Symmetry: D2
Subunit: 253 residues, 4 copies
C-alpha cells in the first residue's frame, strides 16, 4: 500500500536515541523513511544510529539541545548544506518532573515548558521554513493524555502538553494552506523506561488497568501505526488533529 | 516498496453500510485494496449490484448484503444469514445515514426522527449485532462515521448534527463496554468532501468560497482521502486506539 | 438584590419538575424570582407541587403534559398562549435513565431513552423558540450529563442521548442566538438524588465516585441551582451553546 | 440571592485597572466582594480604585508585575501582614502579539508565554498556599477562544491560552480536595480598547458578526455574570471547567 509508504521521505525525530521516540523512529524507518536520530548525548545518538544502520535503515546522527535556538538553527543549516530535506518532523523530545504545584519551583516549571513546548515551536518553525517552499511536509507533535486530562503532581507537564495540542492547531492554521499537515499523537500509559517507576508500583499498575477500557498498558510499538499514518500520504487531508493512543482511557469515566 | 504489515487487512471481512455509492463506497474500496473481503450494503439494489461487480472486476472479493439500516428485523435477519454462512464480520463501518436540511422551527418531528433513526439508531443496532459476534472471537473493529457536526453545529442541519454528536458518544460508549474484549471502536469525521451528497453545496459559489476560506487547507476533501483513516482504524495499526474520532477536514475544526 | 441574577417578571417552564432535580431547579428559579410552570405526567402530583410552591410565596402554575407527546406539548403551549403566559425560560430536564450493557439492550429501551431525553427537548425547545423569537429574548437550558462528554459501561443510551443534548444545545445556538435567544446546557455529575439511589447504596460505586472526583464527594441537588439560574438570567446573555459540567472536577482529570 | 453573594470574600483581579479585568472586578464588587485592583500604571490603578470607592465598593491597589516572581511573593507577604485574605483570584493579566510563526522571534514567543501562562501559575500557586489552610478558594483563569481554536498570527497567545485551560485542570486536580474550585472563562470577541484595531478594521468587524451566531461583539460587562458565578457558592461543585462567553462562536462552523 503506497499510501502508507514513506520511501523517499526523511524524518527527524527529536529524542529518538531511546524510549518512545526511538520506537517511533524505528517504525518510520520500516515504513521506508530515512531517519535523523536526535538526542542530547552525541555518543548515545551515534550508538543508536549504528544500530539503525545495522538493521538496514538509512540513518544519520543529528544531536542537538532542543532548548537551544542556536543549535537548532545550526543543525538545520548543516542539513541544508548536505542536501538533506526534512519532510517529516516528530517533536518527541520532552522531560517529566513530578512535584505538587505548591512545592514547584518556577525554574522547574520553566524547564518543563522549554523542553516540551518551546522546543516544538522552535524546531517546528525551522522545519516549516523549508517545507513551505517545497509545498509538502508533515509535523507530528507528541502530546499526552495530559493534553486533555490533568493529573496531580504533573502540572507543568500537563500545561506544556495542553500547549502542544494548541500548538498543533496553530501550525495547521498557518501552514495547512502550504500543503503541510501538522497533527499530534497523545500516548497513554506505555510500557517504557520513563514509566518504570509507575509500572513497578502495584497500586499504580492496578489503577492503569482498571482506568483503561482496554484493561492494559500500551506497548511502545503500538504508537508506530499512528506515527506512520500521520507521516504518510494517507493523512494528507488530516490537519490539526490529536490522536490519543490510550486503550480508550480518555474516552471514559 | 516497504514491507510493513500493520496496515494489511487480509483475512478480514468488512461490512460497510451505505457503501453502494459516495464516501462509503470509497472507504469500502480502500479496505478491499488493503486486503479485506467486502460486504456492500445499500438501498438501491441496482446501484449495489453495479458496485459489487465493479469491485469484482478489479480483483476484490465482494458481495451484496441487503438490509434497511432502520429495520431491526432486517438487520438481525442479515446477520443470521452471515452467521450460517460462517462469515465473520471483523470490521464494521457504520456509514449509512441521510441528511435533511430544514430550520428547527419548520422541522416536522417525523423528519427529525428519520434522521436520528437512519444515522444514530442504525449504528447502535448494527454495532450491537456485530459486537456480540466479535466479543467471543476476542477481536474486532467498529468504525462509525460522524461529521464535523459531531462537534460544531450548523444552522438548518440540527437533526443531523444531533445524530452525529450521538455517533461520537456512541463510539465512546462502545469503547467503554467492548475495548476489554479486544474490540476497537473509533470514528471518522469527514469534513466537506466532493460527493454528490454535497452537490447542492458545491454548486453554490457562496458556500464553495466559504469552505475554501474556512478550511486552513483551503480546499474540499476528496472521498479517497478518507481511505487512509479507514484502513488505519481497521488494521492492527490502531490496536491500542479506542474511542477516538479522527476528523478529516483540512483543519476546519481546529480553527476559528 | 443582584439585578443581573434576578428573574423577576420572567416565567420558566421546567419539564419534569413535579419532583427530583427538576423540582430543585424550579425551586431555585422561583427563589431567583421567576414564575414557575411545573410540569410532569401526573396532574395530581403536578398540582400538589404547585400548591407547595405557592404556600411558601413562589408563583407557580400547573402545566402537566407527556414530554414524549407532540400533540400534548402543542396543546399545552396553546393553552399558555391563550392565557397570555409567555415562556421566557425553558429548562429541559425531563428524561429517563436505563442501565443495561449494549449487547443486552432492547431497541425499545434505547428508543425510550432517546425519546424522553432528546426528542422531547427538541419538540419543546422548538415550540418555545417560536414564541421567543418575535419577543427577541429567551433562555433554553438543556440538561445534559457528564456522560455528554465521557462514556461509562451500561449507560450507553443515556450517554448517547445526553451527547445528543450537548449537540442539540449547539444547534439551538446556531439557529436562534441571532434572535436574542441563549441556549445552553448543564451536565450534572453524580448527584445525591433519588434516581441514583442504587448507585448511592452501592459501597463500591460510592467509593469510586469519592476517589474519581477531585472534590472527593458527590454533588447535592441544590448544587445545580446556581448554574440553572445563571443560564436563565441576564447574567448569561452573551453565553451561548455552552455546556457547564457540575461534577466536582471529574471530567477534567484522569 | 445568597448563592451569588460574595460578601465576606476578597477578590484579587490582575490587570484590573482597565478593560475586561476592570469590568469583572466591578461585577465582583457589585456582588459584595472586597476588591484588590492590579495593573502596571499606578496612576490608572489609583484612579480605578477611586471610581470603585465613589460608588461604595471596598477597593484597594495591589502592585506587582505579574511576570516578576519576587514582586508577586512580596505582594502576598504584604497582604498577609495586613490581614488581607485572597479568597478569589482572577488571573486576567496578559498581552497579545500578532506575528506569523515563521517570522516570530523566540523572545516574543517567550514574553507572551510568561505574561499569559507562567504568571497565572506563579500567582495561582501563591494564592493557593493561603487558600488551602483556609479550606476555601476560587481561582478563575482567563483563557480565550484560542484556548480551543487556533487563529493565524496569534500562535504564542493561542498556546499560552491552551496552557491556561490545562493549568485550570491541573489546579482542580491538586486543589479541589482542599475545597478550592479552579475554573476558567474564555471571552470571545469583546469591545475593548485592546481590540480597537480589529474593531476598526471593517473586514474583521464584519467577520466577527458573521462568524458569531449572536451576530455581535460582546461588551466587557458581559463577562460579569460568569465571573461572579465562578466566584460564588453557585459554583461550589464546578471544577476544572472553562466557560466560553462568545455569543456562540466556538459552538458553530
Ligand atoms: Cl514495543
Ligand atoms: Cl476521491
Ligand atoms: Cl408527575
Ligand atoms: Cl461594558
Ligand atoms: Mg478471515
Ligand atoms: Mg412576558
Ligand atoms: Mg458593596
Amino acid at each position: 500500500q503506497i499510501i502508507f509508504d514513506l520511501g523517499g521521505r526523511t524524518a527527524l525525530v527529536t529524542g529518538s536515541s531511546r524510549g518512545l521516540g526511538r520506537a517511533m523512529a524505528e517504525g518510520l524507518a520500516v515504513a521506508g523513511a530515512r531517519i535523523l536520530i536526535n538526542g542530547t548525548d552525541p555518543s548515545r545518538v551515534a550508538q543508536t544510529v549504528q544500530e539503525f544502520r545495522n538493521v538496514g535503515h538509512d540513518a544519520e546522527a543529528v544531536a542537538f539541545d532542543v532548548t537551544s535556538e542556536s543549535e537548532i538553527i545550526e543543525a538545520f543549516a548543516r542539513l541544508d548544506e548536505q542536501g538533506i530535506d526534512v519532510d517529516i518532523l516528530v517533536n518527541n523530545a520532552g522531560i517529566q518532573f513530578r512535584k505538587p504545584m505548591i512545592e514547584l519551583e518556577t525554574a522547574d516549571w520553566q524547564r518543563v515548558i522549554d523542553t516540551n513546548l518551546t522546543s516544538a515551536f522552535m524546531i517546528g518553525r525551522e522545519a516549516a521554513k523549508r517545507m513551505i517552499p517545497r509545498g509538502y511536509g508533515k509535523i507530528v507533535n507528541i502530546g499526552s493524555l495530559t493534553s486533555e486530562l490533568a493529573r496531580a503532581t504533573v502540572a507543568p507537564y500537563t500545561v506544556a502538553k495542553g500547549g502542544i495540542k494548541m500548538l498543533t492547531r496553530a501550525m495547521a492554521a498557518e501552514w495547512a494552506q502550504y500543503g503541510i499537515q501538522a497533527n499530534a499523537i497523545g500516548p497513554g500509559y506505555m510500557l517504557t523506561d520513563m514509566n518504570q517507576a509507575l509500572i513497578d508500583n502495584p497500586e499504580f499498575d492496578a489503577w492503569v488497568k482498571a482506568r483503561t477500557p482496554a484493561k492494559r498498558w500500551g506497548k511502545p510499538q503500538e504508537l508506530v501505526g499512528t506515527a506512520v499514518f500521520l507521516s504518510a500520504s494517507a493523512s494528507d487531508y488530516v490537519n490539526g488533529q490529536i490522536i490519543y493512543v490510550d486503550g480508550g482511557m480518555l474516552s471514559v469515566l
